[PDB]
């Protein structure tokens, strides 16, 4: 039994990578250690992927230990799949396009130091062990956590120093892009957020180059995995009777009348080749007449066309505000923006932990059935309005948001950040300032890029950069980001966050004059 | 945005109806509230039943927030659940013979005045929800509860006022008809429940009044469903081969024998078929022979010929009561009416919250396996003993009571009944008086009607109406019905809770003399 | 309604078994009773086993009643599934082969005499049950606890005589066999522990003796079952181009060189016969070389040949001991045998129920995915080590040791037990010596036996009697057992416990190298 280590500095703290020791059976395994806290990052992928498919079952793990502490306790909870999440975010984009073999991650910490956070360590690992594993990933990538003291960018702050910090944010990328953002912060600029994304893209690439090294001197070999055949005849011949059809279908106004349309051409074009050949898989059929059409709108889009509801990419869909719309509680509210719509809570009782912010959603909220997602999206909107609440002895009492997405079309997390704003308000809670949230999208190609305001649920294939802000009218309170394409520079960055600034504004003076 | 209010007085309450604001995906969504208890109500129906389907999916959900009281927290709970049968009992009939769709009712309350229970405000709203989806129901229905005050009925009685009622019941009904009876009384006559049922019906009407009015206004269209064909063909040259001999192998009264004859007519019938035409999926083909012997059962009760087992109308099954069974316990008793048998243990120490019930339905009571409904059983079961459980003051022991369905072949619930009373006496609580419960069914065809006592396992399909009665000597303690068809008059429950009072003080003589 | 009791002294006390009055639904039931301890068993066992099947669903169920004790609360319980386990073991192998029926056992106490635990007394119903069920079932099976006090056995000691006792083991077998023993001990020799299961395999004869006339008076008619047909011929011309060429490949040393000449062999022989006949479920083909395959292992260890990866019967694999792996916990350790290994934590803070053992078996231990066994393995790998903790005055401190089983292919829970020894004394636990496990299997064939040390997991199908053995230097601490053959005599355990307890030194020998 020999270990194979490699160790670095990464600012202020030493990071070991420690593999081939233990857990010899997964596919890759590693045991990443930065100043005492080490988390034991392990990785499975199934060999061979089931018949066809359509879906890449990846899942991500994180389980804390109560001894890793010195401590007995006397799930998984809730912050565990959180970060569960700030580690699947980053890597689900860099499988391979039709990579379909299961692959789990699990993240176990091992031991704590109370200084030094495990997120960013499993986020390490992950990467650590994803790219040893020798599975199809385009790895690796890097994790870094940004402070704001001083007016100045930290590198991993402690938590601690964190206290003293006026920024709290994660970024995560591979060598010449960033992945994924997720952050809070008491109200800071666009350009100031956007300083951190970048200071922490480059201040972890020390991490992706250890991570690196230690893949030639230990990873195992590449997997021959191989795309999988794409039938580029059979969808050559659908878009040969539909393709132009359809481009012209999305010309057509009247809402229900364009759907009649589109329904024809997909069922004249599927009958015609089920009358030329047959036994064709309809379903496989109209599998690829969605690509085409949803390839008409992203073309229209980059073309200048209005979106698929008639809307230019800066328009924000129809605002709609009710304030103190129940009854018997301290503080409610009504925010409807379009589609998506969100009846939030306020009630007060004998800063976090004095602040709790519950999520609900419900599946009637997309005209649909099912069981009574509401977690990651809880957070996010509780991160858009912790910069807005009172110094605890401006007000001393715990207060409790509660959002019940009643409708869903857009980003029921923005909404219910809005709402949140509101409630408050009309519960009599001194916020600082009112809040708002915005979910926007990127679509790019090649040079040609397109920032969408309030992107619709159905426009997140347009979603090459998907990303929320959240804040009052003197800076951002919560940045959410989510890259799946390369390009897209720190300068087109600063772009989107501007138009991003515009529909808050915007929406914001819709709200406050609600609550006149 | 623009919402639909329709207000109304529904006696000492005022009750308003907003739709067509909120949850605008939904099939259809209404905010019920009376006097500041509102519950949002929402309902969405599956355009397209899966293929054949052959089973109803209807599921409600009630979910109670604790905001909607001011409070912040530190399931569904047991009360959540046992209100979403209060919900589901009544709306399931209405949906018409061969509905099939999805349907899922979520009822969430969001502002609570103590004094207003929700549950009435959460059933009317699921009713008007449904009306105006236009999902095919035949509704709409109304919900009242009824007490019992210085000896006359009072309509929607709050909280405290209950303090001082003798009885708390809930019907609820169409126009023409009460189809659910959900009840607890302190003892007494089935004409003071009968009056309280009826009155309540009529109290109601006020609310699908203005319910209908509303679907004037904003109803949806009715949707153009359609039935979905019945192969009366088929079953026409099934019943062509083995209605009759069936029907005469109902006469013979060895059960063992007649199964045999029966499974004769079966097969041969099934094999003949599948030798004139075949491919007829002998599992449709069985599937209609356990119809016409299912009528075959029907036509002889209603005629007057022996129950299945041999018992006529009014035959209570053998009982067999046995008190002192257990070793250990501070009370047990082994009560068991025919096949169906519960194990009954009573455990004192340091009314109800001082007075605990639970119920175990294990798999094998019905001699099957699975996993290890005594929910809604449970209660009732309670609410049968509850009238004679001594004034705490007279007895400062919290008690509780625990019930295991050792054998299940009629009534479990109302066997348990019967069990508690006498574990309670052999623990030595000084309650009232012994009281038991019966199971009851009512077939009814045209006029001519027969009302069924102790109704077996396998004869719940005869029972057009099947309800629960129990009590002492003096008068009724719980009283439960659910009606699927309609006609059934006043006059025909009189009579039906009269026989049920038979076989009750017929159960307690024989109780009453185990425990001399 | 008539019960049939069966009354008999089981030494020290009564033992009474009623059946015929309690769920007469169930395919057979008992209360079994003892000096006022009841445990009500049942049984189910469906009539006709899913087309085909291919495995034998056996589940029991062990629920304890709060009421039992005359108390009131204010699933299951770990102990319950714990118990539930002692009882499926023994009857578990009792099944003919080839039953596939469903077969639920469930087991609930109904009343507690503090002074006799209700495990065996369940163990009794279980046997009694299935015994009068007519299930095919080749029983039955008595069950019983040994202690130590005064260097003498005892039967069945109450839970203040374990007070005074140095052992705590229970066995349960035949007539003419003992199927399983779980125990606990303080530290005694192979020959003390062997004369515990002879003594109470002897003492326990009286209870399968009561049961055999029971069934006499009660028992109901023998299932006319029926093993179902086994294509005798199909495995027979697989074998014909198979059984020679693989008992070859066997002898081929390079691993990896094995499995290609076994995989040519796998793949030309289904080829061959798909090429003579077609349609023949490859499945089951490759089902029927998987078990010649398994029987020229079986083969060739019987004869003395070396065992899959090389080693003699009584080789074990190599080891390899870390102390001190993780920086913040208060003690840790990293224990491996071949490819099966353990990270082991030890916290302390302000015996048991002051020491709590924990164990966690995740997916990729085995190189798979799944969900993140784990609760049998725990017990046992504690009773392991509950011999040598300090006497609590000497140690005020409760402990607690996590094991994570990182990788597996032998016994995780007899290396937990290695681990949690080395932890505990990195974490500076006085226990009074280290401690080791180890998993041994027994393969016989008429009077050729082989005792196997350290087993693989893939040698699990040589376990005609499988155990497992953990202790000091100077006696054993824990010992398990399960034997699914006959013969074995109390002679051949002696030689298998001797050859386990050469492997326990050995292990030792290495550990107390390691922590020098």
Redesign the interface.
């Known amino acids: 039994?020999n270990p194979i280590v490699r160790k670095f500095q990464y600012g202020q703290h030493t990071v070991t990578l420690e593999t081939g020791?233990?857990?010899?059976?997964?596919?890759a395994?590693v045991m990443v250690?930065m100043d005492?806290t080490?988390v034991?990052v392990?990785?499975?992928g199934?060999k061979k992927a089931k018949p066809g498919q359509d879906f890449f079952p990846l899942?991500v793990?994180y389980?804390e230990?109560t001894?890793?502490?010195?401590?007995?306790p006397g799930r998984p909870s809730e912050g565990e799949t959180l970060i569960a999440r700030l580690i699947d975010r980053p890597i689900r984009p860099l499988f391979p396009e039709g990579f379909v073999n299961?692959?789990?991650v699990?993240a176990?910490v091992?031991?704590?130091?109370p200084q030094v956070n495990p997120d960013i360590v499993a986020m390490i690992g992950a990467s650590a062990a994803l790219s040893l594993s020798g599975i199809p990933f385009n790895g690796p990538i890097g994790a870094a956590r940004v402070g704001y003291i001083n007016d100045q960018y930290v590198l991993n702050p402690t938590q601690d120093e964190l206290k003293e910090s006026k920024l709290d944010l994660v970024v995560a990328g591979t060598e010449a892009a960033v992945l994924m953002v997720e952050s809070e912060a008491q109200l800071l600029s666009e350009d100031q957020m956007l300083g951190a994304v970048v200071f922490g893209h480059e201040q972890q690439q020390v991490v992706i180059q250890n991570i690196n090294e230690l893949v030639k001197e230990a990873g195992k070999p590449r997997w021959d995995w191989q795309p999988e055949p794409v039938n580029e005849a059979l969808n050559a011949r659908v878009a040969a009777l539909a393709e132009a059809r359809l481009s012209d279908a999305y010309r057509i106004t009247d809402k229900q009348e364009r759907y009649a349309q589109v329904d024809v051409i997909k069922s004249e074009t599927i009958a015609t080749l089920l009358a030329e050949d047959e036994t064709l898989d309809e379903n496989e059929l109209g599998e690829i007449l969605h690509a085409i059409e949803k390839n008409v709108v992203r073309s229209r889009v980059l073309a200048g066309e209005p979106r698929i509801d008639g809307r230019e990419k800066d328009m924000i869909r129809?605002l709609?505000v009710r304030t103190g719309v129940?009854?018997?509680?301290?503080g409610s509210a009504?925010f409807?923006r379009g589609?998506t719509?969100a009846?939030v809570?306020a009630?007060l009782?004998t800063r976090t932990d004095t602040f709790?912010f519950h999520y609900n959603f419900?599946?009637?909220?997309?005209?649909?059935?099912?069981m009574?997602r509401e977690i990651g999206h809880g957070r996010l909107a509780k991160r858009g309005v912790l910069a807005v609440m009172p110094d605890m002895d401006k007000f001393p009492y715990?207060v409790?948001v509660?959002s019940?997405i009643?409708?869903?079309?857009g980003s029921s997390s923005m909404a219910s950040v809005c709402g949140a704003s509101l409630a408050l308000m009309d519960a009599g809670v001194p916020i600082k300032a009112a809040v708002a949230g915005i979910a926007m999208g990127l679509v790019k190609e090649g040079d040609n890029y397109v920032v969408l305001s309030d992107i619709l649920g159905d426009e997140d294939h347009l979603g090459d950069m998907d990303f929320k802000v959240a804040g009052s009218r003197d800076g951002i309170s919560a940045l959410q980001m989510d890259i799946k394409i390369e390009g897209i520079t720190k300068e087109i960055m600063q772009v989107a966050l501007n138009q991003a600034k515009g529909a808050r504004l915007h929406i914001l003076g819709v709200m406050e004059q609600a609550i006149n």
């Open positions: 039994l020791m233990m857990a010899r059976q997964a596919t395994a250690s005492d080490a034991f392990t990785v499975v199934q899942t793990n389980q230990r001894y890793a502490a010195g401590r007995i299961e692959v789990q699990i176990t091992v031991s704590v130091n129809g709609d129940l009854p018997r509680t301290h009504l409807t589609e719509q009846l809570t009630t009782g709790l419900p599946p009637y909220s997309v005209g649909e059935t099912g009574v715990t409790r509660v019940e009643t409708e869903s079309n």
